[PDB]
Design an enzyme around this catalytic site. Sequence first.
Site, short mmCIF file in Angstrom:
data_model
loop_
_atom_site.label_atom_id
_atom_site.label_comp_id
_atom_site.label_asym_id
_atom_site.label_seq_id
_atom_site.Cartn_x
_atom_site.Cartn_y
_atom_site.Cartn_z
N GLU A 126 20.18 30.05 18.34
CA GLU A 126 20.48 28.62 18.41
C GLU A 126 20.51 27.95 17.02
OE1 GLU A 126 17.38 27.84 21.41
OE2 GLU A 126 18.96 27.26 22.83
N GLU A 153 19.13 35.03 27.54
CA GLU A 153 18.07 34.28 28.22
C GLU A 153 18.57 33.82 29.58
OE1 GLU A 153 16.66 31.03 25.72
OE2 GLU A 153 16.86 32.28 23.93
#
Lengths: 121, 1024, 129
Positions: B481, B550
């Site tokens: 991220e 994820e």
Amino acid sequence: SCLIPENLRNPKKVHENRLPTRAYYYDQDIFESLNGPWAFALFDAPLDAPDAKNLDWETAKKWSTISVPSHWELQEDWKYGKPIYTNVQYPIPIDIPNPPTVNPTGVYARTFELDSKSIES
Amino acid sequence: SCLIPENLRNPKKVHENRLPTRAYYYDQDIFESLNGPWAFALFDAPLDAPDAKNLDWETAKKWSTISVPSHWELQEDWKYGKPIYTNVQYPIPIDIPNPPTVNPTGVYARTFELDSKSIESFEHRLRFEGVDNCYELYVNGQYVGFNKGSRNGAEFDIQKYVSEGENLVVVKVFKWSDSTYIEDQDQWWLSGIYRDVSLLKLPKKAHIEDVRVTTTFVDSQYQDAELSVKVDVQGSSYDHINFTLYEPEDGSKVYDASSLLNEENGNTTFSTKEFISFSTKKNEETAFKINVKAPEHWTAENPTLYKYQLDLIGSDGSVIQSIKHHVGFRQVELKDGNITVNGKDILFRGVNRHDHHPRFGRAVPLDFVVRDLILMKKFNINAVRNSHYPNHPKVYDLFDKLGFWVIDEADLETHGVQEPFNRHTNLEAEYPDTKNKLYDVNAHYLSDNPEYEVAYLDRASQLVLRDVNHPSIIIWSLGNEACYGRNHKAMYKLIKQLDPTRLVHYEGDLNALSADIFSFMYPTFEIMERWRKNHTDENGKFEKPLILCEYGHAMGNGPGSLKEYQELFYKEKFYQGGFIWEWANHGIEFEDVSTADGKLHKAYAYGGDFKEEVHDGVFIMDGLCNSEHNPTPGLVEYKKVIEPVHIKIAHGSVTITNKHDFITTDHLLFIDKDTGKTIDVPSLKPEESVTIPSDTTYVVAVLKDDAGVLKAGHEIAWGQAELPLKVPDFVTETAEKAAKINDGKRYVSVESSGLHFILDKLLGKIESLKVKGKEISSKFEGSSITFWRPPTNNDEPRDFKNWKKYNIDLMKQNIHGVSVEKGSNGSLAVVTVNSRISPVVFYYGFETVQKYTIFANKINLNTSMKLTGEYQPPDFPRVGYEFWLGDSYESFEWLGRGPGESYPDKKESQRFGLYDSKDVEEFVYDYPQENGNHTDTHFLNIKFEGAGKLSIFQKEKPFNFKISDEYGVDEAAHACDVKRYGRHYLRLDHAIHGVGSEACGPAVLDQYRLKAQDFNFEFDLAFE
Amino acid sequence: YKKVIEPVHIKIAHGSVTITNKHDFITTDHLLFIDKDTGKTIDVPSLKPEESVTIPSDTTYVVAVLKDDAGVLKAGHEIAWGQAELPLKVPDFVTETAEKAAKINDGKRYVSVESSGLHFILDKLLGKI
Ligand SMILES: [Mn+3]
């Protein structure tokens, strides 16, 4: 709904035997105050309250007193509950025209004296 | 900015004088631990810290000590501060590349002894395994160097600086720097020397600096392989190198914590089962390529290893230095659009694992890491993602030996650049297919910032070069991220130059312009499917596959619908599995003041508990395991959905399908649980299946022998035939008994021999029901039928907001009429209650009829609930009765799902059987919430002391129940804050809302939502 | 146990603190003595085993604490302490003795005492409040 009395769920039962509204004038010679301490008892709902057609003063004498005028949510030690503040929202469920079944019922009682001349005059 | 030192605000100052990264090998003869108590002082900012060029040991002696390794926010009595939790948001102002001026600065100091012979015999280095955030290093009052990269290692040449006798090491550690901007992982902010420190003594005239080991199959049938060993030798005084490969030890090898962690030794003979030997010649390249005949493959399911010994040899033929390590014969490729190992398109059965310990933080004892991995293996996990940084270097042998597919990930997160943007634009949601356009807006700050290229490359170089030789690592990840920019492209080019043998992952790169794999986090099935279809051509070919780095956010009660994700994984070759977030709650142990007690109790902290200015609350608690790293119902469910063998029982047949990637079913014993005798199951290859005729209901797949870290008899997979709902053979007493019925003004009594039934007609409340010494009554607050549940973490963001908005917690029963009649067909009496169940403020509610048919030994309760009115909720948490249990109550037993809790979309791991409450440790959530429900319950027996049982069953459908003690669950911050009544209650439910994963992921799926609708259900309360 | 075996005795009486070293070998030099009532430290002479000293003081509470990290103990770790004995003081609670009208209801079983802000009910059969 037989667990809710008919008059508490009838929008048309605005009153029974109320005199027609007239212009208000206070007159000391006509008005006699019944303010002060009244016998008072609070019940969970109408069905727990006594039949007033059978309530003696001898019975009601034994109750605690409340002072008229006053709200019963504003007593010493919050004896009969506390105030509720809502702005827009109803504090009850909306089921027009029914009130809630658990409906706090307060019975007031007091006496007053009447003369022989009084009823005649 | 002269009030902030230059090196804490220079993105290019990645280090000063750090040696080049090399492959990590621990050697007892070379490594000398400097762990233990160090002199330590904390200062407000760099300018208050002493000049280390003038710091005596005589001065530092007088300071308090701190123990290395440890974080300084995790000391006795919080001496040097408390941990800070942020998820996305930076805990500093964003002024790239400046850190805050007030910047906690910790100065460490200790001494070590050096011999006359030592300085002559050896090259001396200092190796720091991890220091957060960055540091400058001094030896004997002389500056050695500087380093950034908290989860990376660092070695410094110390030879110039050392003296005979006492030597002084001083480390200046800084909490913040320009590096903070790229270290914004969703975790605790913790500082200090949190990993090992060592003094290295390498042989002086010549030593082995670096080793590269690669295994490439020569052939498309993956038989013969080329073993390539390249050695970098530093210095002149050597002759050649020897190399010995030993006979393989099968991956079924038995290990425990002790043997996995054994670090010995100098005189210890590594192995003697020689397989191949090679010698180099004087003045020739210290490298070679060997052909190896059909070696045993290294796989995560079977981590077979060849031990090897590499010897550096002098002129006199003596051994200067040895490396004892292992080779795993394995090749990873991108082949026909799939991540391929040894030609096989593998499936990730994975988790993200952070470094976390409830007391030590990121300073995790290796012992504890081993504990983690054993547990993973015990629960069918085959892969781990190093979210979001490399771990301690010793951990990777653990992956090698136990067998995990590993994603080793660069220490690089930039998430916080988005927070001001999110708030300014009032962004509600991010979606895997579109969110990259949002991150593109702010990439220019860091990931598309040229000033950071050096830093980004360093994270890559450090990642790859330390861990290149571990067969378990199949994928390098560029970080997490951090948006997408030129720096990522640069990292990709470098990693491919450094190590061509592995694939590159980076989820921030949606279109994988500089990655070899596609990756989503928390995607919807629809979103997965859009992507699949848009990347599969008309022929059915795809260029790259999709993983879920994820998914199935494991926060609190959940995750729901792991089943549906799995079905998708098995259906499409394009999907290659996922890694659930996360392995364990990040809770820190602390003393909490109880909301229930007024007293002090041990608890596990999340955001807010350490009184941060800014924090992200309970998002700390998002693991399959709790803060103490023990399994939750989440982990229990995951093990079942990912089981590598399918066992289906239907129509007098057991169908067994092998769902492994590589291994056979031979290691498994199949037991017919109905008989106890074993089932002869043919050796099944991956994807092969067999149907065997059988009358069995329940088949278990179990381990034959101790293998790896698993014991003989350990359950791998199981199946059951579906169980029809059978009415118990309870005999209702329909004989005519005289019964006294007393229908008073408010209360109605029904009395008979052994029976007492009292109902408050005003409330609809059962005042008392006593049958044959067994008593229940309604747990009444407003209504006899209730709908609320303490919101789960998943409930919070949306479902709870709805349920609160519609006042479902304030549902009221308003009685309209009560009907009392004498018993008919064997009946003692029939009491019928008509009411409206509706919350204050609202129109919507249920026209309700509750018919109580009373028998001598049984009470039939028919409930009819008609949904009426405008402005209704979409769904309810729950619907059913609440009963107080009598003082006699001792325990319960049920036929249904168990032994643990179960919910509509989280139930399949809980097989059918007869369960006793006495055999079950009921699960305590680190964050109090909805718990303890049992779904698909056939019948429930409640045992009362000295009076037998009360049997409860719902007609024609299985039901839900909870038996507990507890309240104040909604508002209890920690387990110790939960209040307890002086008696137990039964929560008896017709239906319950699913659990989902909406805290971060999809809402409870449609088929599991408790949609607003009419309810009709019948219960029997049968008294023994 | 830690308290009864403390290797330093601190006795506070008659405006005096008496400190006695009860170690076998070591001195009191490693110890910082804090007057807990003020927070300021007390200058205590180096005491040998069995030596003692009386220091005039108004203190109620004296703590003996470790000056520096030593062995496996941390700076500030408590080794010994003493307190002056504390007399029992009646709190300064003001009982409302003003005349309030009070309703007393002495029933057959229960006795009620009601006043503004007060409600007292006793079961005469049981002696139960
Ligand atoms: Mn708490």
